[PDB]
Coordinates of C-alpha atoms and ligand atoms in Angstrom, one line a residue:
Chain A
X1 CA -67.6 -25.1 -29.4
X2 CA -67.0 -27.8 -31.1
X3 CA -63.7 -30.5 -30.4
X4 CA -62.0 -31.1 -33.4
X5 CA -58.5 -33.2 -33.1
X6 CA -57.3 -30.4 -35.3
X7 CA -53.2 -29.8 -36.7
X8 CA -50.6 -27.3 -36.4
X9 CA -51.5 -24.2 -39.8
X10 CA -48.6 -26.1 -41.9
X11 CA -47.6 -23.1 -43.9
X12 CA -44.6 -22.6 -42.3
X13 CA -43.6 -26.4 -42.8
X14 CA -44.5 -26.2 -46.5
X15 CA -41.9 -23.5 -47.2
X16 CA -39.6 -26.5 -45.9
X17 CA -40.5 -29.4 -48.1
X18 CA -38.1 -30.6 -51.0
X19 CA -37.7 -33.9 -53.3
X20 CA -34.6 -35.5 -52.7
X21 CA -34.1 -38.9 -55.4
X22 CA -30.8 -40.8 -55.0
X23 CA -30.6 -43.4 -57.6
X24 CA -33.7 -45.1 -57.7
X25 CA -35.2 -44.0 -54.3
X26 CA -36.8 -41.0 -54.5
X27 CA -38.5 -39.2 -50.7
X28 CA -38.6 -35.9 -49.0
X29 CA -36.2 -33.9 -47.4
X30 CA -36.7 -31.2 -44.8
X31 CA -34.3 -28.3 -46.4
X32 CA -33.4 -25.6 -43.3
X33 CA -31.1 -22.9 -43.8
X34 CA -28.2 -24.1 -46.8
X35 CA -29.6 -28.4 -45.1
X36 CA -31.2 -30.5 -46.4
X37 CA -32.7 -33.7 -44.2
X38 CA -34.1 -36.7 -45.0
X39 CA -33.7 -40.6 -44.1
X40 CA -31.0 -42.4 -44.8
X41 CA -32.1 -45.1 -46.3
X42 CA -32.8 -43.1 -49.4
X43 CA -29.3 -43.9 -50.1
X44 CA -30.0 -48.0 -50.0
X53 CA -23.5 -50.6 -43.4
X54 CA -24.6 -46.7 -44.3
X55 CA -20.7 -45.8 -43.3
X56 CA -19.9 -48.1 -46.3
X57 CA -22.7 -46.5 -49.0
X58 CA -22.1 -43.1 -47.9
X59 CA -19.3 -43.0 -48.6
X60 CA -19.4 -44.4 -52.0
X61 CA -21.6 -41.3 -53.1
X62 CA -20.7 -38.3 -54.4
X63 CA -22.9 -34.9 -54.4
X64 CA -23.4 -34.9 -57.4
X65 CA -25.5 -38.7 -57.0
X66 CA -28.5 -36.4 -54.8
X67 CA -30.5 -34.5 -56.6
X68 CA -32.7 -32.2 -54.4
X69 CA -36.1 -30.5 -56.0
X70 CA -37.4 -27.0 -54.2
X71 CA -40.4 -27.0 -56.5
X72 CA -39.7 -26.6 -60.0
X73 CA -35.5 -25.8 -59.0
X74 CA -33.0 -27.6 -58.6
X75 CA -30.7 -27.4 -56.0
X76 CA -27.2 -28.5 -56.3
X77 CA -25.5 -30.5 -53.4
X78 CA -22.1 -29.3 -51.8
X79 CA -22.1 -32.1 -49.0
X80 CA -23.4 -34.7 -46.9
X81 CA -22.4 -35.7 -44.1
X82 CA -24.7 -38.6 -41.9
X83 CA -26.5 -37.8 -37.8
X84 CA -27.7 -41.1 -36.7
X85 CA -31.0 -42.3 -39.1
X86 CA -31.4 -38.7 -40.7
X87 CA -29.0 -38.1 -43.7
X88 CA -28.4 -34.2 -44.2
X89 CA -27.5 -32.4 -47.8
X90 CA -25.7 -29.3 -47.9
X91 CA -26.9 -27.9 -50.3
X92 CA -25.0 -23.8 -52.0
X93 CA -29.4 -22.4 -51.8
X94 CA -29.9 -21.1 -48.3
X95 CA -34.0 -22.0 -47.7
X96 CA -35.0 -18.0 -47.5
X97 CA -38.4 -19.4 -46.7
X98 CA -37.0 -21.0 -43.4
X99 CA -38.5 -20.3 -40.6
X100 CA -38.0 -20.1 -37.1
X101 CA -36.4 -23.6 -36.1
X102 CA -35.9 -25.9 -33.7
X103 CA -35.5 -29.2 -33.1
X104 CA -36.9 -31.7 -29.9
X105 CA -37.6 -35.2 -29.1
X106 CA -41.2 -35.6 -28.1
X107 CA -41.9 -37.8 -24.7
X108 CA -45.1 -40.2 -25.6
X109 CA -47.7 -39.2 -25.3
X110 CA -47.1 -35.8 -26.6
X111 CA -49.2 -34.6 -29.9
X112 CA -47.8 -33.2 -33.0
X113 CA -48.4 -32.4 -37.0
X114 CA -47.7 -34.2 -39.5
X115 CA -47.7 -33.3 -42.8
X116 CA -47.4 -35.5 -45.4
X117 CA -45.4 -35.6 -48.8
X118 CA -44.8 -37.1 -51.7
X119 CA -42.3 -35.9 -53.9
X120 CA -41.4 -33.2 -52.4
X121 CA -45.4 -31.8 -52.5
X122 CA -47.4 -31.5 -48.9
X123 CA -50.4 -33.6 -49.5
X124 CA -51.9 -33.6 -46.3
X125 CA -52.1 -32.6 -42.9
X126 CA -53.3 -34.2 -39.6
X127 CA -52.6 -34.2 -35.5
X128 CA -51.3 -37.5 -33.9
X129 CA -49.6 -39.1 -30.6
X130 CA -46.1 -41.0 -30.3
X131 CA -47.7 -43.6 -28.9
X132 CA -45.8 -44.6 -25.3
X133 CA -45.2 -47.8 -27.7
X134 CA -43.4 -45.2 -29.7
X135 CA -45.2 -45.5 -32.9
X136 CA -47.8 -42.9 -34.4
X137 CA -50.7 -44.4 -35.8
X138 CA -50.2 -42.4 -39.3
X139 CA -51.5 -41.9 -42.6
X140 CA -48.8 -43.3 -44.8
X141 CA -48.1 -44.4 -48.4
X142 CA -45.1 -45.3 -50.4
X143 CA -43.0 -41.5 -51.1
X144 CA -44.1 -40.4 -48.1
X145 CA -40.8 -41.0 -46.0
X146 CA -39.0 -37.9 -44.9
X147 CA -42.3 -36.2 -43.9
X148 CA -42.6 -34.4 -40.7
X149 CA -43.8 -34.8 -37.7
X150 CA -43.8 -30.4 -36.2
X151 CA -45.4 -28.1 -33.1
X152 CA -45.7 -24.4 -33.6
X153 CA -44.3 -22.6 -30.6
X154 CA -45.9 -18.9 -30.8
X155 CA -43.7 -18.0 -34.7
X156 CA -41.3 -20.8 -34.1
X157 CA -41.6 -24.6 -35.9
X158 CA -39.4 -27.3 -33.2
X159 CA -39.8 -29.8 -36.0
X160 CA -40.0 -33.2 -34.0
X161 CA -40.3 -36.5 -36.4
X162 CA -39.2 -37.7 -39.7
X163 CA -41.1 -40.6 -40.9
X164 CA -38.8 -43.3 -41.3
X165 CA -40.9 -46.2 -43.0
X166 CA -44.1 -49.0 -41.4
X167 CA -44.7 -52.0 -39.8
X168 CA -46.8 -55.2 -40.2
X169 CA -49.2 -54.2 -37.6
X170 CA -50.1 -50.3 -40.2
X171 CA -48.7 -48.0 -37.4
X172 CA -45.1 -46.1 -38.2
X173 CA -41.8 -45.4 -36.6
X174 CA -39.3 -42.5 -37.7
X175 CA -36.1 -40.4 -35.8
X176 CA -36.6 -36.8 -34.2
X177 CA -34.7 -34.4 -36.9
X178 CA -31.3 -35.3 -35.1
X179 CA -31.5 -39.1 -36.9
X180 CA -32.7 -40.9 -33.5
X181 CA -35.1 -43.0 -34.3
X182 CA -38.2 -43.1 -31.7
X183 CA -38.6 -46.2 -30.1
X184 CA -36.6 -49.7 -30.1
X185 CA -36.6 -49.8 -33.9
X186 CA -34.3 -50.1 -37.1
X187 CA -34.4 -48.7 -40.5
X188 CA -33.8 -51.2 -42.0
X189 CA -36.1 -54.4 -43.3
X190 CA -35.6 -56.9 -40.8
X191 CA -38.5 -58.4 -38.2
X192 CA -38.9 -55.5 -36.4
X193 CA -42.9 -55.7 -33.7
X194 CA -44.1 -52.6 -32.0
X195 CA -44.7 -53.7 -28.1
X196 CA -47.8 -54.0 -27.0
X197 CA -49.5 -50.2 -26.5
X198 CA -51.3 -48.4 -24.1
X199 CA -53.5 -45.6 -23.6
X200 CA -52.7 -41.9 -22.8
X201 CA -54.1 -41.6 -19.6
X202 CA -53.4 -37.7 -19.1
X203 CA -54.8 -37.7 -23.2
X204 CA -57.6 -38.8 -21.9
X205 CA -58.9 -36.9 -19.0
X206 CA -57.6 -33.6 -20.6
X207 CA -60.4 -35.5 -23.2
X208 CA -62.9 -35.5 -20.5
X209 CA -62.3 -32.2 -19.3
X210 CA -62.8 -30.7 -22.8
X211 CA -65.9 -32.5 -23.1
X212 CA -66.9 -30.8 -19.5
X213 CA -66.1 -27.4 -21.8
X214 CA -68.7 -27.9 -24.0
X215 CA -70.9 -29.3 -22.6
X216 CA -70.8 -32.9 -22.1
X217 CA -71.3 -34.1 -18.0
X218 CA -73.1 -37.2 -17.9
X219 CA -70.1 -39.2 -17.6
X220 CA -68.8 -36.9 -13.9
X221 CA -69.7 -38.9 -10.7
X222 CA -70.0 -37.7 -7.0
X223 CA -66.4 -39.7 -6.2
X224 CA -63.2 -39.6 -6.0
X225 CA -60.2 -41.5 -5.5
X226 CA -56.2 -41.7 -4.5
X227 CA -53.6 -41.7 -7.8
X228 CA -52.5 -44.6 -6.0
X229 CA -55.9 -47.0 -6.0
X230 CA -56.6 -45.0 -9.8
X231 CA -52.8 -46.2 -10.4
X232 CA -54.2 -49.6 -10.2
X233 CA -57.3 -49.4 -12.2
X234 CA -54.9 -48.0 -14.8
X235 CA -52.5 -50.9 -15.2
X236 CA -55.7 -53.7 -15.2
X237 CA -56.9 -51.8 -18.1
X238 CA -53.8 -50.7 -20.2
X239 CA -53.6 -47.2 -19.5
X240 CA -50.6 -45.4 -19.1
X241 CA -49.7 -44.6 -15.3
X242 CA -50.7 -40.8 -14.1
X243 CA -47.7 -38.9 -12.6
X244 CA -48.6 -36.3 -10.0
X245 CA -46.3 -34.2 -13.3
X246 CA -50.1 -34.8 -14.8
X247 CA -52.5 -34.1 -12.5
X248 CA -50.4 -30.7 -12.3
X249 CA -50.5 -30.1 -15.9
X250 CA -53.6 -31.1 -15.3
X251 CA -55.0 -28.4 -12.5
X252 CA -55.8 -25.4 -14.8
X253 CA -58.2 -27.1 -16.7
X254 CA -59.2 -28.5 -13.6
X255 CA -59.8 -24.7 -11.9
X256 CA -61.4 -23.9 -14.8
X257 CA -63.8 -27.0 -15.0
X258 CA -64.3 -27.5 -11.4
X259 CA -63.8 -31.2 -11.4
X260 CA -60.7 -32.4 -9.2
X261 CA -58.3 -34.5 -11.4
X262 CA -58.6 -36.9 -8.8
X263 CA -62.7 -36.9 -9.3
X264 CA -62.2 -36.5 -12.6
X265 CA -60.7 -39.4 -12.3
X266 CA -63.2 -41.7 -10.5
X267 CA -65.4 -40.6 -13.6
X268 CA -63.0 -42.1 -15.9
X269 CA -62.3 -45.3 -13.3
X270 CA -65.6 -46.0 -14.1
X271 CA -65.6 -45.6 -18.0
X272 CA -63.5 -48.5 -18.1
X273 CA -64.8 -50.6 -15.1
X274 CA -68.5 -50.3 -17.3
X275 CA -68.1 -48.6 -20.5
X276 CA -70.5 -45.8 -22.5
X277 CA -73.8 -47.5 -22.3
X278 CA -74.6 -46.4 -25.6
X279 CA -73.7 -43.0 -24.9
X280 CA -70.4 -41.0 -26.5
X281 CA -68.4 -38.6 -25.7
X282 CA -67.8 -35.3 -27.9
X283 CA -69.4 -37.1 -30.3
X284 CA -66.9 -40.8 -29.4
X285 CA -67.7 -44.5 -27.9
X286 CA -64.5 -44.3 -27.1
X287 CA -61.8 -42.9 -24.9
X288 CA -60.0 -40.2 -27.3
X289 CA -56.8 -40.0 -25.5
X290 CA -54.1 -38.2 -28.5
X291 CA -55.5 -34.4 -26.6
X292 CA -52.5 -33.2 -24.5
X293 CA -53.8 -31.2 -22.0
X294 CA -52.1 -28.4 -23.3
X295 CA -53.7 -28.9 -26.7
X296 CA -57.2 -29.2 -24.7
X297 CA -56.1 -25.3 -23.0
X298 CA -55.2 -24.2 -26.6
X299 CA -58.5 -25.2 -28.4
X300 CA -61.3 -24.1 -26.0
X301 CA -58.8 -20.4 -25.6
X302 CA -58.4 -19.4 -29.2
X303 CA -53.9 -19.9 -29.2
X304 CA -53.4 -18.2 -32.6
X305 CA -50.1 -18.7 -34.6
Chain B
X1 CA -51.5 -48.6 -44.6
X2 CA -53.6 -46.2 -42.7
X3 CA -56.0 -44.0 -42.9
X4 CA -56.5 -40.9 -40.5
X5 CA -59.2 -37.9 -41.3
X6 CA -56.7 -35.9 -43.1
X7 CA -56.9 -32.3 -44.3
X8 CA -55.5 -30.3 -47.2
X9 CA -52.1 -28.3 -46.1
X10 CA -52.9 -25.0 -44.9
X11 CA -50.0 -22.7 -46.3
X12 CA -51.9 -21.0 -49.6
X13 CA -54.8 -20.6 -47.0
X14 CA -52.7 -18.7 -44.4
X15 CA -51.2 -16.2 -46.5
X16 CA -55.1 -15.2 -47.4
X17 CA -55.6 -14.2 -43.4
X18 CA -56.0 -10.5 -42.7
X19 CA -58.0 -9.0 -39.7
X20 CA -61.6 -7.1 -41.0
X21 CA -62.6 -4.5 -37.9
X22 CA -65.3 -2.4 -38.3
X23 CA -66.0 0.1 -34.9
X24 CA -65.6 -2.5 -32.4
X25 CA -66.3 -6.3 -34.5
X26 CA -63.7 -7.5 -35.1
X27 CA -63.3 -11.0 -37.8
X28 CA -61.7 -12.8 -40.3
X29 CA -60.8 -11.7 -43.3
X30 CA -60.1 -13.3 -46.8
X31 CA -57.3 -11.2 -48.8
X32 CA -57.5 -12.6 -52.3
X33 CA -56.2 -9.9 -55.1
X34 CA -57.2 -6.5 -54.4
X35 CA -59.7 -8.3 -52.5
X36 CA -60.9 -8.4 -48.3
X37 CA -63.8 -10.8 -48.3
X38 CA -65.2 -11.3 -45.2
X39 CA -68.5 -11.7 -43.5
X40 CA -71.1 -8.7 -43.6
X41 CA -72.1 -9.0 -40.5
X42 CA -68.9 -6.9 -39.2
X43 CA -71.0 -3.8 -40.6
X44 CA -73.7 -3.9 -37.4
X45 CA -73.7 -3.8 -33.9
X46 CA -75.9 -4.8 -30.9
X47 CA -79.5 -3.7 -31.6
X48 CA -78.3 -4.2 -35.4
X49 CA -78.7 -7.5 -34.3
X50 CA -81.7 -9.2 -34.0
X51 CA -83.0 -7.3 -37.9
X52 CA -80.0 -5.6 -39.3
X53 CA -80.6 -4.0 -42.3
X54 CA -77.7 -3.9 -44.9
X55 CA -77.5 -2.0 -47.4
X56 CA -78.9 0.7 -45.2
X57 CA -75.5 0.7 -42.9
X58 CA -73.5 0.0 -45.2
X59 CA -74.1 2.6 -47.4
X60 CA -73.4 5.2 -43.9
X61 CA -70.3 3.3 -43.8
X62 CA -66.8 5.1 -45.9
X63 CA -63.6 2.8 -46.7
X64 CA -62.1 4.2 -43.3
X65 CA -64.5 3.0 -40.9
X66 CA -62.8 -0.6 -42.2
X67 CA -59.7 -1.4 -40.7
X68 CA -57.7 -3.9 -42.3
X69 CA -54.9 -5.6 -41.0
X70 CA -52.3 -8.3 -42.8
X71 CA -49.7 -8.7 -40.3
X72 CA -47.7 -6.0 -39.2
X73 CA -49.5 -4.2 -42.1
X74 CA -52.3 -1.8 -42.2
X75 CA -54.8 -2.1 -45.7
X76 CA -55.7 0.6 -47.2
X77 CA -59.9 0.0 -48.1
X78 CA -60.2 2.0 -51.5
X79 CA -64.3 0.5 -52.2
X80 CA -66.8 -0.9 -50.4
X81 CA -69.6 -4.3 -51.8
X82 CA -72.6 -6.5 -51.1
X83 CA -72.6 -9.2 -52.1
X84 CA -75.7 -11.9 -50.1
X85 CA -73.9 -11.9 -46.7
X86 CA -70.0 -11.1 -48.0
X87 CA -68.8 -8.1 -47.8
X88 CA -66.0 -6.8 -50.2
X89 CA -63.4 -4.6 -48.9
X90 CA -61.3 -3.7 -52.1
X91 CA -57.8 -2.3 -51.3
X92 CA -54.9 -0.6 -52.1
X93 CA -52.1 -3.6 -52.7
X94 CA -52.6 -7.1 -54.1
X95 CA -51.8 -9.6 -51.8
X96 CA -48.0 -11.3 -53.2
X97 CA -49.3 -14.2 -51.5
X98 CA -52.4 -15.4 -53.3
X99 CA -52.6 -18.4 -54.7
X100 CA -54.3 -20.0 -57.8
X101 CA -57.9 -20.0 -57.0
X102 CA -61.6 -20.7 -57.4
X103 CA -64.6 -20.2 -56.1
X104 CA -66.8 -23.1 -55.7
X105 CA -70.3 -24.3 -53.9
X106 CA -70.4 -27.6 -52.0
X107 CA -72.7 -29.9 -51.8
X108 CA -73.5 -32.1 -47.6
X109 CA -71.4 -34.7 -47.3
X110 CA -69.0 -32.5 -48.6
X111 CA -65.9 -32.9 -46.9
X112 CA -63.1 -30.0 -47.1
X113 CA -60.7 -28.3 -44.3
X114 CA -61.0 -25.3 -41.8
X115 CA -58.3 -22.6 -40.7
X116 CA -60.0 -21.4 -38.5
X117 CA -58.7 -18.0 -37.2
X118 CA -59.2 -14.9 -34.8
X119 CA -58.0 -11.8 -35.3
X120 CA -56.4 -12.7 -38.7
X121 CA -54.0 -15.8 -37.3
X122 CA -54.2 -19.0 -37.8
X123 CA -54.7 -21.2 -35.1
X124 CA -55.3 -24.5 -36.5
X125 CA -57.0 -25.9 -39.0
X126 CA -59.2 -29.9 -39.2
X127 CA -61.7 -31.2 -41.2
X128 CA -65.1 -31.5 -41.1
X129 CA -68.0 -32.4 -43.8
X130 CA -71.0 -30.3 -44.9
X131 CA -73.8 -32.1 -42.8
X132 CA -76.8 -33.0 -45.1
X133 CA -78.1 -30.3 -42.7
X134 CA -76.1 -27.5 -44.3
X135 CA -74.4 -26.9 -41.2
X136 CA -71.1 -27.5 -40.4
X137 CA -69.3 -29.3 -36.9
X138 CA -66.6 -27.0 -36.3
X139 CA -64.7 -25.7 -33.8
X140 CA -64.8 -22.5 -33.2
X141 CA -64.8 -19.8 -30.5
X142 CA -65.6 -15.4 -30.0
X143 CA -63.4 -14.0 -33.1
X144 CA -63.4 -17.0 -35.6
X145 CA -65.8 -15.4 -38.2
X146 CA -64.5 -15.3 -41.6
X147 CA -62.5 -18.8 -41.2
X148 CA -62.9 -20.1 -44.1
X149 CA -63.4 -23.9 -45.5
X150 CA -61.4 -24.8 -48.1
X151 CA -60.2 -28.0 -51.1
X152 CA -56.4 -27.3 -52.6
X153 CA -56.7 -30.7 -55.7
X154 CA -53.8 -30.4 -57.8
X155 CA -52.1 -26.5 -57.0
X156 CA -55.2 -24.5 -56.9
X157 CA -56.9 -23.4 -53.5
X158 CA -61.1 -24.6 -54.0
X159 CA -62.7 -21.7 -51.5
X160 CA -66.4 -23.6 -50.7
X161 CA -66.8 -22.4 -46.8
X162 CA -67.0 -18.9 -45.2
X163 CA -67.8 -18.9 -41.1
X164 CA -70.2 -16.5 -40.1
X165 CA -72.5 -17.8 -36.2
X166 CA -73.0 -20.5 -34.2
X167 CA -76.7 -21.9 -33.9
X168 CA -77.7 -23.1 -30.7
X169 CA -76.6 -26.4 -30.5
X170 CA -73.5 -25.9 -31.5
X171 CA -73.4 -26.3 -34.9
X172 CA -71.8 -23.6 -37.1
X173 CA -73.4 -22.1 -40.4
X174 CA -72.1 -20.5 -43.1
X175 CA -71.9 -19.2 -46.8
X176 CA -70.3 -20.0 -49.9
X177 CA -67.9 -17.1 -51.0
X178 CA -70.6 -15.4 -53.2
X179 CA -72.0 -15.0 -49.4
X180 CA -74.9 -17.5 -50.2
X181 CA -75.7 -18.9 -46.9
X182 CA -75.6 -23.0 -46.6
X183 CA -79.1 -24.0 -45.4
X184 CA -82.0 -22.0 -44.7
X185 CA -80.1 -19.9 -42.3
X186 CA -80.2 -15.8 -42.3
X187 CA -77.2 -13.9 -40.7
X188 CA -79.5 -12.5 -37.5
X189 CA -79.4 -13.3 -34.1
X190 CA -83.4 -14.7 -34.5
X191 CA -84.5 -18.3 -33.4
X192 CA -82.1 -21.1 -35.8
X193 CA -82.3 -24.5 -34.8
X194 CA -81.2 -26.7 -37.7
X195 CA -82.8 -29.1 -39.5
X196 CA -82.0 -33.2 -37.7
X197 CA -78.9 -33.9 -38.8
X198 CA -79.0 -37.4 -40.7
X199 CA -75.8 -39.4 -41.3
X200 CA -74.3 -39.3 -45.0
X201 CA -74.7 -42.8 -46.3
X202 CA -72.4 -42.6 -49.0
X203 CA -69.2 -41.7 -47.2
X204 CA -69.7 -44.2 -44.1
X205 CA -70.0 -47.2 -47.1
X206 CA -66.4 -45.0 -48.4
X207 CA -64.8 -45.7 -44.5
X208 CA -66.3 -49.4 -45.2
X209 CA -64.7 -49.5 -48.7
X210 CA -61.1 -47.9 -46.6
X211 CA -61.3 -50.1 -44.6
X212 CA -61.3 -53.1 -46.2
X213 CA -58.8 -51.5 -48.4
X214 CA -56.5 -51.8 -45.3
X215 CA -57.6 -55.5 -44.3
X216 CA -60.7 -54.7 -41.9
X217 CA -63.0 -57.9 -42.9
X218 CA -64.9 -58.5 -39.9
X219 CA -68.3 -55.9 -41.4
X220 CA -68.4 -57.9 -44.2
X221 CA -71.0 -60.2 -45.0
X222 CA -72.7 -63.1 -47.1
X223 CA -75.6 -60.2 -48.9
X224 CA -76.9 -58.5 -50.7
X225 CA -80.2 -56.3 -51.2
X226 CA -82.3 -53.7 -53.7
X227 CA -81.6 -49.9 -53.5
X228 CA -85.0 -49.3 -52.4
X229 CA -85.0 -52.1 -48.9
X230 CA -81.6 -50.9 -48.1
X231 CA -82.6 -46.8 -47.9
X232 CA -85.9 -48.3 -46.2
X233 CA -83.6 -50.4 -43.6
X234 CA -81.3 -47.0 -43.5
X235 CA -83.8 -44.2 -42.9
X236 CA -84.7 -45.7 -39.8
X237 CA -81.6 -45.3 -38.4
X238 CA -81.4 -41.5 -39.7
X239 CA -79.4 -42.7 -42.7
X240 CA -79.8 -40.2 -45.9
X241 CA -81.1 -41.8 -48.7
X242 CA -79.0 -43.5 -51.3
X243 CA -79.3 -42.9 -55.1
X244 CA -77.9 -44.3 -58.1
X245 CA -75.8 -41.8 -58.0
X246 CA -74.0 -42.4 -55.0
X247 CA -73.3 -46.0 -56.4
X248 CA -72.0 -45.2 -59.7
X249 CA -69.9 -43.0 -57.1
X250 CA -69.0 -46.0 -55.1
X251 CA -67.8 -48.4 -58.3
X252 CA -64.2 -47.5 -58.2
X253 CA -63.9 -48.8 -54.8
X254 CA -66.5 -51.3 -55.1
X255 CA -64.1 -52.8 -58.0
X256 CA -61.1 -51.9 -56.2
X257 CA -62.2 -53.9 -53.5
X258 CA -64.4 -56.9 -55.8
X259 CA -66.8 -55.5 -53.4
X260 CA -70.6 -54.4 -55.1
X261 CA -72.5 -51.5 -53.8
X262 CA -75.3 -53.1 -52.7
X263 CA -73.0 -55.8 -50.8
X264 CA -71.6 -53.4 -48.9
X265 CA -75.0 -51.4 -48.5
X266 CA -76.6 -55.3 -46.8
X267 CA -73.7 -55.1 -44.0
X268 CA -73.2 -51.2 -43.5
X269 CA -77.2 -52.6 -42.7
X270 CA -76.4 -55.6 -40.0
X271 CA -73.9 -53.2 -38.7
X272 CA -76.5 -51.2 -38.0
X273 CA -78.7 -54.2 -37.1
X274 CA -75.7 -54.9 -34.6
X275 CA -73.9 -52.5 -33.5
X276 CA -69.9 -52.9 -33.6
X277 CA -69.7 -55.4 -30.6
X278 CA -66.5 -54.8 -28.6
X279 CA -64.9 -54.5 -32.7
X280 CA -63.2 -51.4 -34.6
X281 CA -63.4 -50.4 -37.3
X282 CA -60.2 -48.1 -38.4
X283 CA -59.6 -47.3 -35.3
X284 CA -63.4 -46.2 -34.4
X285 CA -66.3 -47.4 -31.6
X286 CA -68.7 -44.9 -34.6
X287 CA -69.7 -44.8 -37.9
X288 CA -67.5 -42.3 -40.4
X289 CA -69.5 -40.1 -42.6
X290 CA -67.1 -37.6 -42.8
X291 CA -65.0 -39.2 -46.1
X292 CA -66.2 -39.1 -49.3
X293 CA -66.0 -41.6 -52.1
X294 CA -62.8 -39.4 -53.4
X295 CA -61.1 -38.5 -50.6
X296 CA -60.5 -42.0 -49.9
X297 CA -59.3 -43.4 -53.2
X298 CA -57.1 -40.2 -52.6
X299 CA -55.8 -41.8 -49.2
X300 CA -55.9 -44.9 -50.4
Ligands
QIZ1 O1 -72.1 -16.6 -33.6 C1 -71.3 -16.1 -33.6 N1 -70.2 -15.8 -34.3 C2 -69.1 -17.1 -33.6 C3 -68.6 -18.0 -34.0 N2 -68.3 -19.7 -34.0 C4 -68.5 -20.2 -33.1 C5 -68.6 -18.6 -31.7 C6 -69.0 -19.2 -30.4 C7 -69.1 -18.5 -29.2 C8 -70.0 -17.4 -29.3 C9 -69.5 -16.5 -31.2 C10 -69.4 -17.5 -32.7 C11 -71.6 -14.3 -34.0 C12 -71.4 -13.4 -32.6 C13 -72.6 -13.3 -31.8 O2 -74.1 -14.1 -32.4 C14 -73.9 -13.5 -33.6 C15 -75.2 -13.9 -34.5 C16 -75.5 -13.5 -36.0 F1 -76.8 -13.9 -36.3 C17 -74.1 -13.7 -36.2 CL1 -74.5 -14.0 -38.5 C18 -73.4 -13.7 -35.6 C19 -72.8 -14.3 -34.2

């Protein structure tokens, strides 16, 4: 029993965190094989600024060991520093780009040293509601599949509202953001509907049933109400993904939607669900199954 | 900016997780140097759970009864001893991944990260606090026993908790790494009830300071209060008494935000009276009590 916001064990990623220093700027890098990946703003026209840098301008520190940079290239907003040594702690890994609503763990680092790990979702507006201070740039987001680390995020900046923006490991930004000091605003956020439903299933599995009702709804009727309360549209794919939880709890997805529909039109009424007075949307259907079944890494 | 419930990076603890099997029971062990620590109820059978005599059951066991698995490598047990509710299995190999560590007994209100394991394999890391009733509100399934709570400060791992049992209310009970239970609990299937839980007041105040640092000021007011008047109100909302030690601990946050502790105490009093009124504080509609004053300074 119990439901917690749980991150993947960060050990395989801690073995890859290095400190990248270029001029006055010091941020984090991801050392995989003989390449160190980091935000290209560490050099701060990026083609022009990068052509003026040499390999000895980048000071890479893996613990108390300085790595010698033997090459540098740029892939979108990520700088790739070729180093002489392959990271012996390199795990089985993949670079994946996640969709909004998908969750991942963030290993927050300062000066190439991991200081914290937390779970979070890629918001539908492509920002993450992280917790980052100066020096956290280059901190990475990841998921673990069996023994494979899927790197899905690299932190680049903080928007004026306190939310965060970054890229996948191929340097492609999530969202309409640029790695530059200019006026940038995150779009109005929406609630990740499928994740709220997954969290409602997790509450039922934990014995919290007060919100359940006899009612069911059509997907079209639910989406009319979802649009109204700034909730993301629920697709048939989402309904299918919630299938195993629906089978386990015996509550059809559209039956759980009528409960969500009522929770939105009426509220919690002083009650909580899994110790929360708000509807939690940072647990995907897969996260709920993983936590309420005990999958290990 | 931003405030999140943040756990410590679990890497140093993942390198210590092993699977301990004794008879039919399989739980997790903590392998540090040449010793594997695990809950002593790993030696328990079906009719040795309501009233087990652990000294008696342990004397009947031999080193080859304990099957220890560190990854795909079986470790050889060369000794066994019991320290309170923890079983210490001496092994023939020192863990090369043993970090700088200490065994630390924490007080209620203190926070720590939990590395949840099943079969000696870490599956997730989360953050939680030792509740005033000495239970933890974890996320644990069968086989999680022996999962450890820890803090990682300045390269060192302070182990402060080992998971032992789930109480009938879904909350969890365990011990420090010296086998001493937190709370009035025992490792027996007897009827055990957690005392009525209370809110960790100092942690709520620390979280209110964290919100002020993050630009949330809507809950602040022109009022201040006496410590006794705050405790008289707080006790009625099932909040822990705020001691002068707690007031002193909140000092640095009070200096940083320019809001006296007793002034923040009056903001809290008001929040308890009115509720949030559809508003949130750090993205939360409830007052958060699992961030200590030390955590807030750490994160901010
Ligand atoms: O509770 C137990 N460990 C679990 C841990 N965390 C979470 C759980 C969730 C579900 C089922 C077991 C859970 C065991 C087995 C069941 O009974 C006892 C009784 C005892 F006196 C002791 Cl010391 C341990 C246990």
